[PDB]
Design a protein around this ligand. Sequence first.
Ligand SMILES: OC[C@H]1O[C@@H](O)[C@H](O)[C@@H](O)[C@@H]1O
Ligand SMILES: [Cl-]
Length: 291
Amino acid sequence: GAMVMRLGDAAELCYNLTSSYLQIAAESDSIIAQTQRAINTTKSILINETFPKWSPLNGEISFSYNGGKDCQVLLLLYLSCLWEYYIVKLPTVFIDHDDTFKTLENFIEETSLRYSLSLYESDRDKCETMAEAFETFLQVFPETKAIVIGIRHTDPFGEHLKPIQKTDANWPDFYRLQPLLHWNLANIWSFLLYSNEPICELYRYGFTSLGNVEETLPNPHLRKDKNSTPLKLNFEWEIENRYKHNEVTKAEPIPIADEDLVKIENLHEDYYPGWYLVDDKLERAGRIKKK
Ligand SMILES: OC[C@H]1O[C@@H](O)[C@H](O)[C@@H](O)[C@@H]1O
Ligand SMILES: [Cl-]
């Protein structure tokens, strides 16, 4: 049971859950309303600024997908916008690394099958920079004009970015399409939880940012401790009223890899899941101390 949707069914599903989220009753100072506003901005960037210029059907656009929560939100929104643009397999690139979490590798494969992506992966056993990996990608796919990237302004290297922006001089020449820049961490959790799509299950165990296996720990701000003030959940409504699937769209979480559970159990500590963190400044706090 692999939870596979043909691309059109995936796009329609994403349109429907996004539309459903936009119909949620919320007040003007809520996280849900802020997320609705962020969705509307993303939709305008894609439908008004992107698709009229570059074709998402003929290989002009590739989607950079790394399995993390930001890329996943953006992929759901991108699929929704394809459906909206055209009605109302997908070329995908993953820059792989030798120090990626196994659960994340598993999740990228599972989602490629779920959403009918056409996945290209760079070679994890080659020592090369991201720019170099993308140069090789462009040799394989020379028709590529633009690449969708799921970065936010609060991420490292996120400050000096715009929604439509040519690449750096040492990259292959393409336009970066960056439609998620204005999203905040709380918006990411709200939408992802409401969507009821499978997500990388490391977040369930207290990770808030999936860096590499050597540096990344569950977030210490989420550690359970009798003598801390208990954390409160900001996403109760979304979780309790999450989007209901049907026979075609039915899915399930996939458990973390055996090796990742061993690493988490060896900590002898328990954590709230990642969606108990809403401060963007602390997203990357779960990290081995280095000199
Ligand atoms: O303006 C951004 C891009 O829009 C596309 O529709 C044109 O065909 C390209 O020549 C141009 O770089
Ligand atoms: Cl992440």
